[model samples]
Target chain A: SELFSVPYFIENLKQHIEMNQSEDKIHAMNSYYRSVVSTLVQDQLTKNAVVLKRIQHLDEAYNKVKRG
Target chain B: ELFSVPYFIENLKQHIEMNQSEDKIHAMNSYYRSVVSTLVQDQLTKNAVVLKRIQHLDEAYNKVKRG
Candidate 1:
């Protein structure tokens, strides 16, 4: 019933989780694609959560002095 | 505040009402995605009622489909 195979998700996750690009870049693309695939049950909620989680990460960067 | 809960709901419903096609579900979810991300940013300091409405809207997005 799913367009993507299980390997597609896990493999994409494995790649994105350790990306050299920033999480912001990765998550926006991820959520954008997930939105494109809205056929699965409750996918919108999951997409919203991931967006929120990345915003929390961005907030930490906001507060960080960089200490450089 | 009191406005956008109903505002968002009615706004969303109006979109659904006018479209009357299969694409409305994704359209609403996409619009829903944009607002919450914008609204929840710390700078917005969204009213509690509006925030509650976002959650309610989220709940409703799941059941929606045009048919």
Candidate 2:
């Protein structure tokens, strides 16, 4: 159920952007969000752990970007 | 420099046409790649505003796609 609730996630994201402190933070977050979504969809369609791992890596990258 | 503007505009047009609810997932993927590429290019050309917005745009894109 949670996994399928993309709409709620989208709404949350919109709110986050609207409230972000800076443009850089918003972009970093956006990149992370897209990377995760794309990876999830790809994994769901192909059941590839590699894709999942890629998503995790992207998440790490996003965090790094954000923290900087 | 000259090519970058036309290239961005072309890709942007294509991106807009490709984006739709039914194909949102794919469109989002396309959008992220294009936006990032464009942002970097603009940064190289000294477009500070675009560069600044890229961070937020990227974050927003990622959030929605993940959702």
Candidate 3:
């Protein structure tokens, strides 16, 4: 996973993410983790400010990654 | 996603026969369809990690699949 995405996402969660097994499946795995992770992390937004700011921070990170 | 053990069991049997463990679970998009099948009474577990691209992924996948 030298080049993976969810680890940064790990900061937002209570657990570690694992990639799906097949190569073609990699895309699917990535997408699933993204949704599940994003939802869990974002779920925090409704309850607290600390996590709210955190997801905001990550959005910036994703933006940077997306743009650069 | 509710509590249909039978449908869950069936989807699971299909998953087993498909043996999607080798690579990514979604290699078989249909299986991906299955994994997220949400059968008549299947349940959704709170489950994961990583620098995942969920915002983008969810939109892409659901844009077409949403019903």
Candidate 4:
């Protein structure tokens, strides 16, 4: 069973964000996408220590955008 | 800060599947610009949350995927 495909989810989310055209929504969604990417890199690929910083940054950005 | 199309494009390039095609990239760029054009047209409603529920779905999917 093919359980997961990160690229498919990322691509699909990217397309949906493009459709709405609201900067508010776009920023909100884009930051979340970045976080997902960061998580993927941290867990599956690089395991780079520095990527955690970016994940934090994205988390804050996503929360702030959503709260507004 | 506003969404950065160029930055987003770059990010996609870095993470996309190796076998992903140029055609899909072109489609992505095209869709992105369509949203940008919508912004230029000032078409989004004042009640912005009209579509907020959809974003909720995005979060749901992401959370489920992560788990």
Q: Which pairs clash in model 1?
A: none
Candidate 4: tens digits of C-alpha lDDT, residues B12-34:
34433343543443433333333
Per-residue CA lDDT of model 2 for B1-67, tens digit only, reads 3234344445544665766642554555556655554444442343334433443544455455455
TM-scores of chain A, one for each prediction: 0.28, 0.44, 0.38, 0.41
TM-score of 4: 0.26
Q: How do the residues A1-68 of candidate 3 rate in per-residue lDDT, one tens digit apiece? A: 21223335433321222343444433443354445434644463344333333444434433343343
Taking all chains together, each candidate's TM-score versus the true structure is 0.39, 0.30, 0.26, 0.26
Q: Write the per-residue lDDT of candidate 3 for residues B1-67, one digit (tens) a residue.
A: 2223334344434554667454323433334332332221122322221112222233334433342
Q: List the residue pairs that clash in candidate 4.
A: none
- Complex DockQ per candidate: 0.07, 0.05, 0.07, 0.03
The ten-residue window of minimal lDDT in model 4 chain B covers B47-56
Ranking of all predicted structures according to lDDT, beginning with the best and ending with the worst: 2, 1, 4, 3
Query: What overall lDDT goes with each candidate model?
Result: 0.46, 0.47, 0.36, 0.39
Interface RMSD of 4: 12.1
Put down candidate 1 lDDT per residue, B1-67, tens digits, no spaces. 4434456666667775676552555557546655554555645454444345455555555444331
Off by more than 4 A, model 4: A1-19, A22-47, B1-67
Query: Which run of 10 residues does model 3 chain B get worst, by summed lDDT?
Result: B45-54
- Error at B31, model 4, angstroms: 25
